[PDB]
Structures are given as C-alpha cells and as structure tokens.
A and B are shown apart, each in its own frame.
Chain A
Amino acid sequence: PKIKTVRGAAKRFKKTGKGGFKHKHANLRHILTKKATKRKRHLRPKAMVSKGDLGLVIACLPYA
C-alpha cells in the first residue's frame, strides 16, 4: 500500500528548496504579556528544522 503521510506533521512543516523543512516556532500561542517583545519578535519568522530532528521528519513526511 501507499505510505500514509502523518497528517498532523503535514500541517507543521513545509519543504523548502534545498530539501529542508520550515516550521513555525513554538511559544507564541498564549501567555504573551509576560514574554518580552524582543523574544516574541524572534519567534515570528519561520525557522528551519534542526539537523538531529530531520530524520524524524522525513520519516513522517514521505510525500513532501
């Protein structure tokens, strides 16, 4: 059978040009009054998935 994409991962990551994955940062949902505006400013761009995590993501996203 076809490999089923982990569908909850397909909403967290998007594949980029050289092959890696962009993702939204954690810690920017709620409880923001106490967070600094500098710290919240750096969680707003999308980051690239780290080296050690990438083997866990391509396992999850085979049709990315």
Chain B
Amino acid sequence: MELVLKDAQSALTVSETTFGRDFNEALVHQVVVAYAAGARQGTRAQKTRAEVTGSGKKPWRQKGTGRARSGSIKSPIWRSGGVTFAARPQDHSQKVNKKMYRGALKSILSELVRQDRLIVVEKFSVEAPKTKLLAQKLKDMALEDVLIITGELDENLFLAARNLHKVDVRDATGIDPVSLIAFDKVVMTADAVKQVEEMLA
C-alpha cells in the first residue's frame, strides 16, 4: 500500500500485507477479548463450608427432634455459613497464538487506513516537556483523542501526554489490540511505522 504523510506529502512504502489485509472480525474480536481477560487481576475468594469459622459439631441430633436434619452450622443452606462453590483466585489469561496475535494487529492496521484513522507523521516531538505545548501539538493537527506511536525513547513527549487523558504515547513495541481501537486517530512517526511493519513481517 501507500501511507501519505501529514505534510511532507511523500508517501513511504509499506507492505500491503500489513496495512491492506482484509479485516477479520472473528480474529480481532478474539485478540481484543484475550487482551481484556488477560488484564483481569483475578483476586477474590470466598469461604467454602470447610473455611467458615465454626465447629464441626452436629447442631441437633439426627432423629427425634422434629427439625430438619442438619449436620453443620456451616452448611451453605444455612445463614452465615458456606458458599457452595466458593471462589478462589484464578488466572483469567487466555493463550493467543503468535500468528493469531500478529494476524489481528495486521488486520487492525489494515482497517485503520480504511476508516482513515491512521495518520503517519515523519516526526512528532515537542521541545519542552510541557503539557501546554502538546495541548497545542494536536490543535493544528486537529486531534483530540489520539494515540501517538513513536520509535524513539522520547521522554519529553512522554511526560507531556501523561496528564492529557485522551492522548497516549507508546514506543512501537507495546502497541496492542485495545489501544489501536479505542483511540480515534492513531498517529505514527515514520521511524515507528518502519519498525511496526517489520515485527508484523
């Protein structure tokens, strides 16, 4: 394919496999859910009938009293004892194949040039590490909810979007399923789209 720049108008060359694939929705839905489930901190637990504080004394006798038969004050039928299938902390991660993860990202980047939400820049830096300048760096660009993806380790630019809520700065190696979708524009420097084209082959 071709990716026209923001103002230099000199479209750098990308492989059409990575930015012009047909969209696979079942592939992208699976990798956007496995990203979402692998973000779960599965930290909860309840108490089974073993773990509730109480005695194993049978409350009344088995026969004789006209009550229903019981054998533990910690049974789950009873108030204040026992969750039946109580939770444990678990791992909600999913396995994604690498060719499914890379096929998803190649299918998201192909769709971002379809709905014109990929804009490739050649440089996006900011002189001072100030949020005020970047707040401006995006008015002339006409951006409000954006994800910046750079190839270098720009810490001046990185701090200047740390307070802006709708602006995210990445490093071209930590771009993911849900970040390439949940932002209105994706803006990539030309050194960064060289690397992203590479890792997705």
Do chains A and B make direct contact within the complex (CB under 8 angstroms)? Answer: no
